[PDB]
Nucleic acid binder design. Structure first.
Ligand SMILES: Nc1ncnc2c1ncn2[C@@H]1O[C@H](COP(=O)(O)OP(=O)(O)OP(O)(O)=S)[C@@H](O)[C@H]1O
Ligand SMILES: [Mg+2]
Lengths: 254, 129, 319, 258, 258
DNA sequence: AGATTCTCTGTTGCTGC
DNA sequence: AGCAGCAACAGAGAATCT
């Protein structure tokens, strides 16, 4: 059965904010070691993959895995009742037709409970993550958001190019061209602002700006973002959670 | 006198097509005239307005008259057009191809060499509606 | 299987204006234009698969040389081509500064110009008029009537025609020589017959027959690419006796899986475009083909309705 | 004549915000003991009723009642000049063709004055309030707004059910069902957050969510909202003012009735 | 060549915010004593004129004037990368096809660089400013914005009338009429709130509210706004910068003329 | 913490097929 | 006498600045 209680409804709301808009259907699966969820957009260029370990919850009980699919729009519509500080418990039996969201305030006072209708989705979780990527980099997610928001205005394509000690984002369209160049650096005054880069091979990939814009939402879940690029596979943008992570795999433009 | 650029890029005012539908040239093959008129009616896309023009003009046109039956045959076409036009709002517009044929029945039935003058026309139907 | 090969329509797509076996007059015109320069605004109209997009692409490439990337603005029907795009992006490209040779100009290629909205077409007038000394417009459409007359007044009009048997035969022979394919005269004749002046369709059918059987023979072409649909319909309508037309409709069309809607609609086209019989009998046959269509659109589409339509057409032809 | 001066233009602006959207025409009447106003929506399922006593004003003078009707939209269009802190004076003669709104800053500086055209409305004030309702409850208005905003997403109908010591709001529609259950409680740490309930008879009524959404606007006028329900009449949602109140009477859905 | 470095990208962003919306094409010209820019709207009732002296920059080098025209919309689209605190350098050669905007953070870290395509505009700078205007007045720009925002709701025309020691803004339309009357005054408690007025001749001009609304944007560049009016020419609304100014010249309505 | 401005989304109206 | 595709305008929500 499904029985997962989040300390703050806010965490779940931000996680769902990440799937929001860019995907319509999400397939969740709870099990002994936590909850995972996957959603693929219609064009199949973006995969949103979530993992929340048992420790991210205030209470988690699972003696029998349950897989459940649902319309994200329906889910987010209901995901603004958490008061953020409310407690949220996800509940479902072993053969569910619905998923119950239970928001409660500390005191017995107010109890908002929802029963969301589920969709039947053929279980087919993808495992496209690579052992090694050509290049790996992490930087503050707010910085990544700005970089994406800058360039987006210029083109529907933003190119990411990596060479030794150099990361360069570029957009070129009708009104002109733009570029943002960043360099690796360790800031001891607070390392959450550092920019790391490990390059095994220079990379140069192009992505659709509309998708990178969907991806930047993860900033609200983590201070830093990890970006893993390869010429052999979809790029991975990852936002770590306490016991978990939200991952976005994006196929480069051919 | 400016019309060269019009012949170069502009079609045939639906009024000009209506007056051409009542004209027969004695020096050209009737089949070639029919295909030229069909192409002009199809290119205009406004078969309904052309037909309404034909309907307002036909009583004033000179046509060798035996017993005014020609008008009886054309009431059946006009009724066929009205059924087709009603069906265009109910069904996907595949039937639109047959709409260009009804104006050409006027050329077959009422086209005469006598009709050398352009009859001007109006829109009694919008006022009546 | 891991990857595919490029089709012969794209692989052997002409890149020089000499390789085009289309209309010789307009081809030499565009060749002399690319040789001398001063390309004017143009609108190329015609039918699908005769060398309209390839012609303007070759012209732009030969006219711009290496500056094709930064001097040519391609906009197809797959991209947004509304009033906002014409207002912002096309105007920014026309106003863009670019150092070009003293005989070249920036080219704005607009594929499928017959699909642009009226507002965009109206806004394009002054857009192409105020920057006619550093930006040129080339439209490629299938129906020139869909483009407004003010736009047609500011440009040349090139009407492309169907490709004769000789040109398509020569192009197919060149492709066979370049690909080392086993063929025969009757096979190429059947290919050209099923092409109907469509060079792209001809090359596609040739490549499909090659990859499906290896030998380009009339038997293979007919077994893979069924005979033209309109010709069997014409032979059915032009039948002299009712039983012959009924047998043709039964065996050739109904027993092979052709839907009644396709049969009646193909039937309408054949009649409209018929020239063997007079005008009045053609109009009566079109009238009868219409009632059958109305009955089939109402869901009464069966073989009995088409049989009754043929019977009424024969009764009309029965004096 | 009409002569009513509000200390802060803001109070009047929030009051009008309450009539806003849900009604088009409002009928005001000033008199010796204050100002009242009533507005009924087109479908006649909602009545908005206002009462402002003499003490709510900084200056009020009335030697002759005046009734005046006006378009709500026109009024709100003009009701964003108050700077909130501006002083607002409503002025009208005994047989008016217009209503004058006069906003002035403390100093003689900016004086914004408006002359709003009036509409003629047959005077017919309703007096549908009941002596006793089946059940009565009050709770923080922000809480009521959240409850309404939650459920609204699920259905066009929100049911309110009352049983001894239990108040339950429920919505059930396409995507599923939802419910909010609250219990009476006295919070001494600050009683403006308490939830009172007096039930003489269990009640169970359904209302059109679109209307409850219009009603929640009153939160901006009062910390608490009073809800009075009856199986015999429209429900009353009330927002108290200093010397006055804004009331919303809403007819329960019969099965399909807002 | 063009080489102008702004200490804070924010100043340039606010300046461009002023041209924004009301004009489409802007013609810039850098020279030995600074940068100027002019833009005229399509109806030709508004001219936006800028002047930034050499001292407004952290670094400015010019050995050869350059004139460059561009689409305002394209420029603003790119003008939100300044982080406000970023450093901004405008760069262009003597015969440019583009203008380079270079934003850099203090550290070498992040460098956002843009290459904006230019438009060819016939150089024709206007010099319509007058020696003397009938009346001159200055007042806090936030106050002017409020005055404009008030009246705008009432009409598409706002009249400015000046008589000895009196400035009066008036709007009159469908729902009624409004007016804002201000009087000259020196506030020593802080003179940036004073309202000065020098009247050589009473004036009374009408302007299209849509244009005054475009003009009020200058508040973000200066605490005060100077307004110069004449019955012989377009009115001048001016927002001073440190070494420079942003000016808006607006033609009075003839009876119907913005 | 509050207010203002900008951006995005939804709804309505108009035009074209 | 649908739809659709549209495009434009208005309203609401979120973010930034004072
Ligand atoms: N004259 C020609 N000579 C050689 N190949 C040709 C010729 N015309 C067409 N083709 C082939 O057909 C392909 C497609 O031609 P297109 O120019 O795209 O057709 P089209 O005339 O533009 O009609 P559309 O695009 O359907 S409106 C080319 O890539 C060639 O392989
Ligand atoms: Mg093409």
């Amino acid at each position: 059965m499904l029985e997962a209680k989040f300390e703050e409804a806010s965490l779940f709301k931000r996680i769902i904010d990440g799937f929001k808009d860019c995907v319509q259907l999400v397939n969740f699966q709870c099990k002994e070691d936590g909850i995972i969820a996957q959603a693929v957009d219609d064009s199949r260029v973006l995969l949103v993959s979530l993992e929340i370990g048992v420790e991210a919850f205030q209470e988690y009980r699972c003696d029998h895995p349950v897989t459940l699919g649902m319309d994200l729009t329906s889910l987010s519509k209901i995901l603004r009742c958490g008061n953020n500080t409310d407690t949220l418990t996800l509940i479902a039996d072993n053969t569910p037709d619905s998923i119950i969201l239970l928001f409660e305030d500390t005191k017995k006072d107010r109890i908002a409970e929802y029963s969301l209708k589920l969709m039947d989705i053929d279980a087919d979780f993808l495992k496209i993550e690579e052992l090694q990527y050509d290049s790996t980099l992490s930087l503050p997610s707010s910085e990544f958001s700005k970089i994406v928001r800058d360039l987006s205005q210029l083109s529907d394509s933003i190119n990411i190019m990596i060479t030794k000690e150099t990361i360069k984002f570029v957009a070129d369209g009708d009104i002109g061209s733009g570029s943002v160049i960043i360099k690796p650096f360790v800031d001891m005054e607070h390392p959450e602002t550092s920019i790391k880069l490990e390059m095994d091979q220079p990379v140069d990939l192009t992505f659709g700006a509309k998708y990178l814009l969907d991806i930047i939402k993860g900033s609200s879940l983590s201070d830093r973002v990890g970006i893993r690029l390869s010429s052999e596979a979809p790029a991975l943008f990852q936002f770590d959670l306490k016991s978990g992570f939200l991952q976005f795999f994006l196929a480069p433009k051919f | 006198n400016t019309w060269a650029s019009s012949n170069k890029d502009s079609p045939i005012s639906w009024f000009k097509i209506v007056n051409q539908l009542f004209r027969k040239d004695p020096h050209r093959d009737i089949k070639e005239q029919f295909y030229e008129l069909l192409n002009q009616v199809e290119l205009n896309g406004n078969s309904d307005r052309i037909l309404q023009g034909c309907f307002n003009i036909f009583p004033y046109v000179k046509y060798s008259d035996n017993g005014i039956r020609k008008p009886a045959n054309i009431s059946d076409w006009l009724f066929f057009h009205d059924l087709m036009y009603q069906s265009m709002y109910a069904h996907n517009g595949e039937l639109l191809r047959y709409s260009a044929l009804v104006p050409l029945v006027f050329f077959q039935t009422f086209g005469d060499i006598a009709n050398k003058d352009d009859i001007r026309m109006k829109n009694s139907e919008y006022e009546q509606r | 299987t891991l990857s595919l090969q490029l089709p012969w329509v794209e692989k052997y797509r002409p890149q020089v204006l000499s390789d085009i076996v289309g209309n010789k007059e307009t081809i030499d015109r565009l060749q002399q234009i690319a040789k001398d320069g001063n390309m004017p605004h143009m609108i190329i109209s015609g039918m699908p698969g005769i060398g309209k997009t390839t012609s303007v692409h070759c012209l732009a490439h030969e006219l711009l040389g290496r500056s094709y990337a930064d001097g040519v603005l391609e906009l197809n029907a797959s991209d947004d081509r509304g009033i906002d795009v014409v207002r912002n992006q096309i105007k920014h490209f026309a106003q863009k500064k670019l150092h070009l040779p003293p005989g070249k100009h920036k080219i704005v290629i607009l594929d499928e110009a017959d699909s642009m909205t009226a507002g965009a077409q109206q806004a394009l007038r002054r857009t192409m008029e105020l920057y006619s000394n550093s930006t040129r417009f080339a439209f490629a459409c299938n129906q020139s009537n869909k483009i407004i007359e003010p736009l047609q007044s500011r440009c040349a009009i090139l009407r492309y025609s169907k490709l004769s048997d000789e040109d398509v035969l020569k192009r197919l022979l060149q492709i066979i020589k370049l690909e080392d394919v086993k063929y025969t005269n009757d096979g190429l004749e059947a290919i050209i017959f099923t092409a109907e002046g469509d060079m792209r369709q001809a090359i596609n059918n040739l490549q499909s027959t090659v990859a499906g059987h290896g030998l380009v023979n009339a038997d293979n072409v007919f077994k893979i690419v069924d005979s033209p649909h309109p010709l069997i319909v014409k032979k059915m309508l032009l039948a002299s006796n009712l039983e012959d037309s009924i047998q043709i409709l039964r065996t050739d069309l109904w027993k092979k899986g052709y839907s009644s809607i396709d049969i009646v609609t193909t039937s309408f086209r054949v009649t409209k475009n018929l020239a063997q019989v007079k005008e009045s009998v053609r109009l009566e046959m079109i009238k009868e083909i219409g009632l059958t269509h109305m009955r089939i659109l109402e869901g009464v589409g069966t073989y009995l309705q088409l049989a009754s339509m043929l019977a009424k057409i024969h009764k009309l032809n029965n004096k």
